[PDB]
A = this chain, B = another copy of it.
Amino acid sequence: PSSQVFICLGLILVQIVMVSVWLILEAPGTRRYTLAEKRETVILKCNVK
């Protein structure tokens, strides 16, 4: 009842650290990804591929 939650939150915190460095290196933003072949359109994609 205690160590199960502890291990679950440990794995969740590993994921949290990974996603935290992911967003720190890749702060939120929008790229205006246009179809240069077609143009006349913009995709407000997120700032990372």
Residue A2 interfacial (CB < 8 Å): yes
Q: How many copies does the complex hold?
A: 3
Q: Which applies to chain A's interface (DSSP): helix, strand, loop or mixed?
A: loop
Chain B residues whose C-beta falls within 8 Å of the C-beta of A2 in the assembled complex: 1-2, 5
Shortest beta-carbon distance, A3 to chain B, in Å? 9
Within 8 A of B (CB), among A1-38: 1-2, 5
Minimal beta-carbon separation of A16 from chain B (angstroms):
12
- Residues from chain B with Cβ under 8 Å of A5 in the complex: 2, 5
**Closest chain B CB from A5 CB (angstroms):** 6
Closest to A3 in B: B1
Q: How far is the CB of A12 from chain B (nearest CB, A)?
A: 11
